Write a protein that binds this ligand. Structure first.
Ligand SMILES: NC(=[NH2+])NCCC[C@@H](N)C(=O)O
Lengths: 149, 151
């Protein structure tokens, strides 16, 4: 699976527009799910999101993680991360997991995020819906991981 | 070269008490990571796709219009953390990222080219190397990732 991790002062997530999720300091994680992903692919993303040391702990750089500072996570599902753009300019999403299967996988991932950290600290979107996210990027600090490495 | 493209209704960049230096309305924010062994052909591929990827709908059609077609803007923000290696451990390390003194030369070259291949007034930038705060209204959201070393 693929993940783009961005570090935020906060994020406001809204749908067609009414705010339906919000977080202060922490991480927005765009989570694309490859169609051949295993529950081991999930665990790698979760371990990494919860544990990656992305904050300066005053005086020592790259030291504290989301759990350490008691920060929040917003997980947004982004199938467009499997938009192959090597052919034309029309991205093709043929590696992406099928929407239904994907929702079931996405959910489990969220359960586990809650099981691994804290369930008040994990926010979400409306899986396959138009969303509008005001993100305050801190740094900014972008982190990419394709677990197929 | 590594890039994360995000579709935006707008974007507001501020550097250090915060001061606003850059704004775009509708268009693309582009977190651009520059590999140690990047050549100019790597850069052109980045510049091309950002300008030419059809990330917007139009009438019937989906994935049909690119940033230029709509007279939209780009905000290009260098982001070495894209080469933050996370295979080993929970501390990121950036050994694969290019050296700051040259990255800066490469990034400007790139910015010029971004203007040359579109329009001078449609390309906003960050403040290379410096700490930045960026408000992004993500439209979709739509996230695209390209690693040129896959080509
Ligand atoms: N899908 C979504 N909610 N947001 C992204 C825009 C996708 C659009 N090309 C489409 O309508 O297919």
């Amino acid at each position: 699976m693929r993940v783009v991790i961005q570090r935020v002062k906060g994020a406001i997530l809204s749908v067609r527009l009414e705010i339906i999720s919000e977080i202060k300091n922490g991480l927005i994680c765009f989570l694309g799910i490859h169609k051949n992903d295993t529950w081991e692919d999930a665990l790698y993303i979760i371990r990494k999101c919860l544990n990656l040391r992305l904050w300066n702990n005053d005086n020592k750089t790259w030291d504290k993680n989301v759990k350490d500072l008691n920060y929040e996570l917003l997980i947004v599902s982004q199938f467009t991360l499997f938009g192959n753009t090597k052919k034309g300019n029309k991205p093709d999403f043929h590696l992406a997991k099928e929407p239904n299967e994907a929702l079931i996988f996405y959910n489990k991932i969220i359960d586990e995020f809650k099981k691994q950290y804290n369930d008040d600290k994990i926010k979400i979107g409306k899986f396959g819906n138009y969303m509008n996210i005001d993100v305050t990027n801190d740094g900014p600090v972008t982190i990419y991981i394709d677990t197929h490495d």
